[PDB]
Amino acid sequence: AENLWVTVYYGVPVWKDAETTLFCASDAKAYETEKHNVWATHACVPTDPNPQEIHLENVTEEFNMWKNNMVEQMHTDIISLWDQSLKPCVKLTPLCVTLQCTNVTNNITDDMRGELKNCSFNMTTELRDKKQKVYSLFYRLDVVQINSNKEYRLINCNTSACTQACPKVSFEPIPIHYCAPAGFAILKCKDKKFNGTGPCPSVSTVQCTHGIKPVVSTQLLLNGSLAEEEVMIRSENITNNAKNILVQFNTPVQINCTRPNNNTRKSIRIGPGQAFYATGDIIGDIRQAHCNVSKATWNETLGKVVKQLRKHFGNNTIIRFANSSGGDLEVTTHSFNCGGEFFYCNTSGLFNSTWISNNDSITLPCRIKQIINMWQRIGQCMYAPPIQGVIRCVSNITGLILTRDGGSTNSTTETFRPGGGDMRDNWRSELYKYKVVKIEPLGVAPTRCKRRV
């Protein structure tokens, strides 16, 4: 009996940390969306009607969301997926032309600059033989003064080429699930006070993640899943100012946004098959794009982050909020899509506070672009067609990407500013619950047993 023998085990519950290609899952209503619009919903496998996540009792697991792959994988999947969509969509090669632009029909005070330039230009025809002078409307940001005529050009003309998104497509973020292969598990930190790094007591295996819709947005991140108890403020290295802070809200703060102008679209035959969607007459008043949030709730929720922040910087500390320091329009402003057009909302009004140790709304203005250069584009750009009519969207704010000032001097007055830049932060914000592991079922161990002769 004293002599022990190894006996092999198949089906042993043990895993090694891994990386692997996952795959997407979506629901039937995403295909019911039809209209040939949603990206990759079609090639994407379906979800489960009765999903199950088995809780694993008595086990702890060392998570780290700042050294994860499935957010790098996702970030990549999103960039690829998007870029494959633009291949069929028409090229605006000849739209790069010397425009002759003026201001839009308006009677505004001199201080208020003109942001809608009415531009006429020699465009191409269905026939190589001919040409056509035709006019369109452009935002001031989509053009640059070229040089007593007032002539302009599309801003991309010196940086990159341009390709018009098919209107028969949609930008709506629909929920994606990242399902593992066989013999691969995803482990889910069910602890409701986890900062994203270290041992998690409450853990569960699961095939696919939750419905993670790809909202690509700077400053405040929207429509995301929110915390269960406290407003959790997560970072890789909090002490170091170079690293950003991911704030995850507890309560949703609803923010309504809109383009008040009843814009119109005309279609211009580049020919043949090619067809540019110009911006036609503005029906009605010429107003300003903007977003509203409750000053009451913003007060309330900015009070929550401060209560949490003092747990890291001292009880007797001043924590005020300031606007962006300076940089690209991509990062100096709350960027998002709304109805199919891209927004650039001044966040100075939100981040303008001060906090001591112890009924209207916030109108915040916006800009709008059509030729966009997202994901740090370099050789290619994309013209987002005019969306006919009036546009308005309603969304919750789920989080923030804040940034602290490194001047320091041990001052109890370290202030914060909204940030963005790298878009992995957004998927980092939703994927903090998850980790991918490689299943290894072949156990070997001694029990008093010999195999027969």
Binding site: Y10, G11, P13, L22, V45, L56, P446, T447
Partner: protein, 126 residues
């Protein structure tokens, strides 16, 4: 009782050696996205077959629990029976024996073919 796939993670190696057919079960069945699906579909059978490969080059195609003829080198663990089967978990246990698992496998490989080369001689004389 039925816990679920991996449910006996933090269970003792004795209790976890009950639910083996559950981890062994959910292990096979369950154009951008299209390629992801394909190199995940092969990865799962490659990874699966590599285990059946081992069980087969040993005598343990049964399988689950399979005894053998290579005796336990105390150097590998040296712990008593109770304190691994009624105490430790496989997550834990794996990291101890991890240093020699491939050396242990080699002992198994020779031992099986040795059985076959022998058993032919038995059926040969009888």
């Amino acid at each position: 009782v039925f816990l679920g796939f991996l449910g006996a993670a933090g269970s003792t190696m004795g209790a976890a050696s009950m639910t083996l057919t559950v981890q062994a079960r959910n292990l096979l069945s369950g154009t951008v996205w299209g390629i992801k699906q394909l190199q995940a579909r092969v990865l799962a059978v490659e990874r699966y077959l590599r285990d059946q490969q081992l069980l087969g080059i040993w005598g343990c195609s049964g399988k689950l629990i399979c005894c053998t003829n290579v005796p336990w080198n105390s150097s590998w663990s040296n712990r008593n029976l109770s304190e691994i089967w009624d105490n430790m978990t496989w997550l834990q246990w794996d990291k101890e024996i991890s240093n020699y698992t491939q050396i242990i496998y080699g002992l198994l490989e020779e031992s099986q073919n040795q059985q076959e080369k022998n058993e032919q001689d038995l059926l040969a004389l009888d």
